[PDB]
């Protein structure tokens, strides 16, 4: 065994090893291993991405105009965000400026995805870590109604409703076919909600499962379909025609009316179902404001997103701020430059790839994706792993660092950055949330806080949808209909050699695509994705990434039942296909 | 009455087909899960993880041997001894083969499971391989598309449950009901194609009138699916309706047929 | 002034004359006049249809296959029912039998219409006679929530929801733009609901206004569109294909899944919103079980509807029973024959039409539609009716009689017929409903009873939707897909001369179309529609129709504010375009 | 802020246009009434009747003279001195004229108000006459169809409210947005028309594959409307999709252009 110190942690792989493979209620394939001491406290954590496809390799030699469509298939959960990063990157390389309406519609696509992805995560992925579904069978329907009505104006709260939901669940489990509930962690001592709150939450899980399908109708209008809407280099393909012949063949008033109807419904659901449920989880699980901090009190990163001034990716334009904090110094939000070779770098000393020198980091314009499956001295064998060897290569995920620092990305990271840059809306929302919970601001830097910040961001994004829609309509009222710039569509108009960066904030955090074009074709295409940051393996200094750090020092009630590990991992909304691409 | 057991496994994939399933408008996915099938294993939704999830998988395929339907999303990589996709420390292909052996029938959701999809596009770094090149002794219904249409997925499920049989298929294993005709055979812009009325550059006057996307690379003429009739997301749109040509996403090899913007 | 006796009433046109023109919250154009005595009790009532279009005339010379499309435009409220009666009539004339699935689909079309039309009537047309909308502003939202939860399991019952509805109404009224609520009868002493019941009812008005749009999606699947779906002689045009190439072009499993989803939602809404609201109106307005009896304790008529055995219109097939009662003798339900010239006849001695002898009634196969506007002395002029002359011709509506008797048709009529034929479901339902209200069976023969029976029938029809859908799916599971018979589509296959009758129960009552075909074209097309019966003017014996009878003997609290007249008229769901055609 | 006043009157009509309006999916008719316009007179929905309804009419047209929109459904009959349609004891045409005089603009909903529709079909017993032949000094927007599409009606209303102007119209007064193109120029069965693939008798093999309805009398080739693109009832269907040819119901005189089952 070995022990070393990094980032205020003592990383010690003596003692009992626990393995969780597969991790479920995530996207993609993950393995987690931990060591626990005699006191059932995690002293070592190991994050492993167990899949790889090689989009960066597949993209070589493709037409830049096609790249969005390939990289969109990095992930169907965060669907659209890679397409957005891609058209941004190709436009940056070539020198294309899109019309205002295209930018506005792209911002609507992104805000729609934030609403959808955050909502579904809360209920379908993370919810069962907090809500004991089987305990809902013990609730009193009238007390459930009274609880719901004390928390929200949401209409659906009758005693008869909650009785009907409870009876549906009773019938579901009556034949012994428990389905997704089979062999769960029900009754674990860490389930703290009373029966009535479990029934309320379960009802809401079902309501969210139904309602989420509506949100993505906005993607269908502008992008054709969801999952995997369509985009173009130069803007969007959804030409607009409000008042001319042939509007039946375009985005017309009827299509825009559909979009408005979805926006209103989405804000209502988020504000009156998800927000009060997140606060209720907080109220009953306050100890989790001190568990899972990880890097969130040390190093956090946002690139920024939602440029309000078309084609301007600077600080005065981005509605979701960018910046970095290191060394726990939230008084110093630092600017991020994605071209600077000393800022974003990826290491592979602990990953299944080849570099010429694995002791140094490579900026994505110098990136290399040369897969090399070499797990070394595992317990078991290379095709039958009992324990990864975290002293050697242990993941398909590369290790990104910012100026050599290991960073957390995602809703909590963004919230901290915006708060400390003085964004008034973020400060007001965070302060009101933490006051409602009677918790200090530091309580947000935790597993509970990640969940609270996600809910905050769903509400933020739902409000921004309206803002963007109104901006689009203002342009239309002024006769500004344009949705594509085509003067550099043809390859002969492009520079013979050029490179660009496309970046945004996906639901799970900071996303970048780095592209080089030469002689009309993709010469290099490197992606660094939010879960690449968070699920990162170690670097040459032994520095641990956000997941491994958040798991460190966690108490387990029952070693064989990994509820605490699941709670913290799920609080990041892991996307493993994104992480590996 | 008991519900039919279903095991849903995931190889190399992006999860779009699973997402598509939950977008179903009728029946709602909630109602499919609660009332029409018993979704007995699914990594994206299930409570159990790790050893508890392995126990579910084992228990279901043993207790219901010969009686469950296997749904597969994604595909197995043959490269690196299969360790481009690892589950429970072993190649994913081992889990696919074990699940397939006990199944009564297999549904290959999506272009990944049916044909290969994006990971199998040139140069196919992982040697990703469709389901029917590994499993050769079971009925396999291919439901291609990237992803397939939500209400197509739920209609195929309801058909099988209601009629207690597999859908009739074409020579490639695709259900005739939804894959028997081309997108271009049912496209509302066909009047413009036949008149020579084409979009020539994005957001031109033709585009603003909904003219045909052939010259912008539409692959509707060579693609079989239901997008131009059933449409997407409770009938709200489809790629062409929103101004982009079909990519060909339901067809084998569609990524490597030239640019999406080159004419068919 | 004059007086005479008929049907137990004393018809006296002494005293003050009141005019209500226009009658609103009906379809089409109606005028009503009454005389009241010194006790403000109605002693004379005059029903006048104030429109005519002449479809019977327009139909002459048309191809029989086209007739349904024309007659469907008799009315867009009871949309579909005239097309159904037309295809029945033409198939009866020519000798066409349709396939089972066509019959089942036609029964689904009719049941869908019953659900839609009855629901919209209850809230949008009649509801404001019972609910004081402005008084809803005085309700306590918590007590409204308590009331709603005591009546129903319906989910939407939170105090916050009722406050939000109330606040929306407050903001709508506060700027003085009261819209449809302007100059209403609010505060009239006959408004008996407490404020909480008025708020609950108003919330439900709005819920029904939204939800009704969904019900007609069934019509869109099978019939293309609503209003005014499409039909064919020989079956239905909606070809079915479940498991063959090209199912994208037909009614397929996805289309049937859509239908099923609408059925379930429709039953849920009717059973948990409309039914409890109807019973609550009953509970708070029990005196109205004694007002507006009219002909409902004397003479009632149903033709019957919903043939369950394809092409069999007999008693063993029709799921909604037919029959007639006269002379208050409910112990002898009489058979109806629509070909018998001594049964259905129409008189025009008090209507704006010419017959060779206006003292006799004409069976529809001998019908004549020769419009003749001749109001006589109306205390103004021919273009300024101040007072109709009910001793002379006073309406565009013909006067139908059955064996010379004036009849009531519609939900109450049907319910009485089925009850007294011993239909077990009807007996059980009616008895349980009257028991719950602590009223005798006779209380159903009233204005209140008309409303209760309509709600009853919406519930019945929603159940029958599922039964018919299941029958369709059984046939499909057995490989029986046929939707049309075309052996006699071509006119060369038809009899040179033939005639037929199509009949059904529209939402408002007994509907018949009588058609004669000669040489491939319509020679005669006569319609007798439910509101023709109910809104009928007088006959040569002076006998009064259902609306005039139901108004007789009614006390008015405030003569200038005709709330009691509106309540009773609206209880029949008048459709004036139907009545005149 | 105050909402624009709207007076909705009814001549000879079947009420299909009013029913269509309340089917709107987006915006809901509830939200149009509560938030977008002030529906100040409407016989189908209003509380007041008789003298109280006459008071509303008179008050609104006087207070808001020059400032309200008049919606008209149905038409006036010129026969029998107008007394085929009587309101408040007098010819409907008198109410039409009074309401028109104060209006800023008139919306003629439906084929009745636009052209005549079924009551004007041969032999036109009442001498039913469209609005634009009686009111000759006001802007009249024709929104034809029997009835027009629900979401077309609501889109036209929202356009006018949002943009504070009347829609641009064709030479017949129909909004270009929805009436600029033929049904047949956006029909998903056009591929079949172009291939000579036709339904020949109801429920034949062609019908079960969704072939073209031209030989069954479809009037889509001569009819301008949005049915084949926007579709009906939240996009669920349209006549042709459900197997019946277009009747031509948006076009002047469509009842008298021969049998619905005779070819164009
Ligand atoms: S848009 Fe595509 S599928 Fe449609 S007609 Fe043109 S080429 Fe065919
Ligand atoms: S069905 Fe009618 S509108 Fe469609 S292609 Fe055929 S003729 Fe044209
Ligand atoms: N959100 C998201 Fe997916 C990840 N990680 C991307 O980008
Ligand atoms: N219901 C209805 Fe209409 C009337 N009266 C018809 O038929
Ligand atoms: Fe639904 S997993 Fe998404 S990539 Fe193309 S089908 Fe595969
Ligand atoms: Fe909507 S009233 Fe119905 S008949 Fe043809 S438009 Fe007229
Ligand atoms: S890209 Fe795919 S989603 Fe349909 S329109 Fe073409 S098959
Ligand atoms: S009949 Fe009318 S509803 Fe549309 S498809 Fe033809 S214009
Ligand atoms: Cl799996
Ligand atoms: Cl492929
Ligand atoms: Cl016309
Ligand atoms: Li740029
Ligand atoms: Li018959
Ligand atoms: Mg990368
Ligand atoms: Mg008649
Ligand atoms: Ni992802
Ligand atoms: Ni009617």
From Swiss-Prot, chains A, C:
It comes from the Bacteria. This is Hydrogenase-1 large chain. Keywords: Cell membrane, Membrane, Metal-binding, Nickel, Oxidoreductase. It catalyses: H2 + A = AH2. Ni(2+) binds at residues 75, 78, 575, 578. This is one of three E.coli hydrogenases synthesized in response to different physiological conditions. HYD1 is believed to have a role in hydrogen cycling during fermentative growth. It is found in: Cell membrane. GO terms for biological process: anaerobic electron transport chain; anaerobic respiration; cellular response to starvation; fermentation; hydrogen metabolic process. One of its GO terms (cellular component) is periplasmic side of plasma membrane. The gene is hyaB. It is a peripheral membrane protein. Binds 1 nickel ion per subunit. Signal peptide: none annotated. The keyword Lipid metabolism does not apply. Belongs to the [NiFe]/[NiFeSe] hydrogenase large subunit family. Heterodimer of a large and a small subunit. One of its GO terms (molecular function) is electron transfer activity.
Curated annotation (Swiss-Prot), chains B, D:
Its cofactor is [4Fe-4S] cluster; [3Fe-4S] cluster. Predicted to be exported by the Tat system. The position of the signal peptide cleavage has not been experimentally proven. Residues 1-264 are periplasmic. [4Fe-4S] cluster 1 binds at residues 14, 17, 112, 146. GO terms for biological process: anaerobic respiration. [4Fe-4S] cluster 2 binds at residues 184, 187, 212, 218. Belongs to the [NiFe]/[NiFeSe] hydrogenase small subunit family. This is one of three E.coli hydrogenases synthesized in response to different physiological conditions. HYD1 is believed to have a role in hydrogen cycling during fermentative growth. Heterodimer of a large and a small subunit. This is Hydrogenase-1 small chain. It comes from Escherichia coli O6:H1 (strain CFT073 / ATCC 700928 / UPEC). The chain holds residues 49 to 312 of 372 of the full protein.
């Amino acid at each position: 065994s070995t022990q070393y110190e990094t980032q205020g942690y003592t990383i010690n792989n003596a003692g009992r090893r626990l393995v969780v493979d597969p991790i479920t209620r995530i996207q993609g394939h993950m393995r987690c291993e931990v060591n626990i001491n005699d006191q059932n406290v995690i002293t070592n954590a190991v994050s492993c991405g167990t899949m790889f496809r090689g989009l960066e390799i597949i993209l070589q030699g493709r037409d830049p105009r096609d790249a969005w469509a390939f990289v969109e298939r990095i992930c169907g959960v965060c669907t659209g965000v890679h397409a957005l990063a891609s058209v941004y990157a190709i436009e940056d390389a070539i020198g294309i400026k899109v019309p205002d309406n295209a930018n506005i519609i792209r911002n609507i696509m992104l805000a729609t995805l934030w609403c959808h992805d955050h909502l579904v995560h809360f209920y379908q992925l993370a919810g069962m870590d907090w809500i004991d579904v089987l305990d809902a069978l013990k609730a009193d329907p009238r007390k459930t109604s009274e609880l719901a009505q004390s928390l929200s104006s949401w209409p659906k709260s009758s005693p008869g409703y909650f009785f009907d939901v409870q009876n549906r669940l009773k019938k579901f489990v009556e034949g012994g076919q428990l389905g997704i509930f089979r062999n769960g962690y029900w009754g674990h001592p860490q389930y703290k909600l009373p029966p009535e709150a479990n029934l309320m939450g379960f009802a809401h899980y079902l309501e969210a499962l139904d309602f989420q399908r509506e949100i993505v109708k906005i993607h269908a209008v502008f992008g054709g379909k969801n999952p995997h809407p369509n985009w173009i280099v130069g803007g969007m393909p959804c030409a607009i025609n409000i008042d001319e012949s042939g509007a039946v063949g375009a985005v017309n008033m009827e299509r825009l009316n559909l979009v408005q109807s979805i926006i209103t419904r989405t804000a209502d659901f988020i504000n009156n179902v998800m927000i009060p449920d997140a606060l209720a989880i907080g109220q009953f699980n306050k100890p989790w404001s001190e568990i899972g901090t990880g890097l969130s009190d040390k190093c956090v990163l946002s690139y920024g997103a939602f440029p309000d001034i078309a084609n301007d990716f600077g600080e005065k334009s981005l509605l979701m701020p960018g910046g970095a904090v290191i060394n726990g110094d939230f008084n110093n939000v630092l600017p991020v430059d994605l071209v600077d070779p000393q800022q974003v770098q990826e290491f592979v000393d602990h990953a299944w790839y080849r570099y010429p020198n694995d002791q140094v980091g490579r900026h994505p314009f110098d990136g290399i994706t040369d897969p090399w499956y070499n797990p070394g001295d595992v317990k078991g064998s290379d095709t039958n792993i009992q324990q990864l060897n975290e002293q050697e290569r242990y993941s398909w995920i590369k290790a990104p660092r910012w100026r050599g620092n290991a960073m957390e990305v995602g809703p909590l990271a963004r919230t901290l950055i915006a708060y400390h840059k003085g964004d008034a809306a973020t400060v007001e929302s965070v302060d009101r949330m933490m006051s409602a919970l009677n918790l200090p601001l530091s309580g947000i830097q935790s597993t509970l806080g990640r969940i609270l910040c996600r809910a905050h961001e769903a509400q933020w994004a739902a409000g921004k949808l309206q803002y963007f829609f109104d901006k689009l309509m203002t342009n239309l009222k002024n006769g500004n209909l344009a949705t594509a710039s085509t003067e550099k569509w043809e390859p002969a108009t492009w520079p013979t050699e050029c490179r660009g960066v496309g970046f945004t904030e996906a639901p799970r955090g900071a996303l970048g695509h780095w592209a080089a074009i030469r002689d009309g074709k993709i010469d290099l295409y490197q992606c660094v994705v939010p879960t690449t940051w968070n699920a990162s393996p170690r670097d040459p200094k032994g520095q641990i990434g956000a997941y491994e750090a958040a798991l460190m020092n966690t108490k387990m009630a029952i070693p064989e039942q990994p509820l605490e590990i699941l709670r913290t991992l799920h609080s990041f909304d892991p996307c493993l296909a994104c992480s590996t691409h | 009455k008991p519900r039919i057991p279903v095991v849903w496994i995931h190889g190399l994939e992006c999860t779009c087909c699973t997402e598509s399933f939950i977008r179903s408008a009728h029946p709602l996915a909630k109602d499919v899960i609660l009332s029409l099938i018993s979704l007995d294993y699914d990594d994206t939704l299930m409570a159990a993880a790790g050893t508890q999830a392995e126990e579910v998988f084992e228990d279901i395929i043993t207790q219901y041997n010969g009686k469950y339907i296997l749904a597969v999303e994604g595909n197995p990589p043959l490269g690196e001894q299969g360790m481009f996709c690892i589950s429970s420390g072993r190649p994913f292909i081992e889990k696919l083969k074990r699940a397939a052996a006990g199944a009564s029938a297999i549904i290959a959701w999506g272009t990944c499971a049916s044909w290969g999809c994006v990971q199998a596009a040139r140069p196919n770094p992982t040697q990703a391989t469709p389901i029917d090149k590994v499993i050769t002794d079971k009925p396999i219904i291919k439901v291609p598309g990237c992803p397939p249409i939500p209400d197509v997925m739920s209609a195929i499920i309801t058909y099988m449950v209601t009629f207690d049989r597999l859908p009739d298929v074409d020579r490639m294993g695709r259900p005739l009901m939804f894959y028997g005709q081309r997108i271009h055979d049912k496209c509302y812009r066909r009047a413009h194609f036949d008149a020579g009325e084409f979009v020539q550059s994005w957001d031109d006057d033709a585009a603003r009138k909904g003219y045909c996307l052939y010259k912008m690379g539409c692959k509707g003429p060579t693609t079989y699916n239901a997008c131009s009739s059933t449409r997407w997301n409770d009938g709200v749109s489809f790629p062409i309706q929103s101004g982009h040509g079909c990519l060909g996403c339901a067809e084998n090899g569609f990524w490597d047929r030239g640019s999406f913007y080159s004419r068919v």
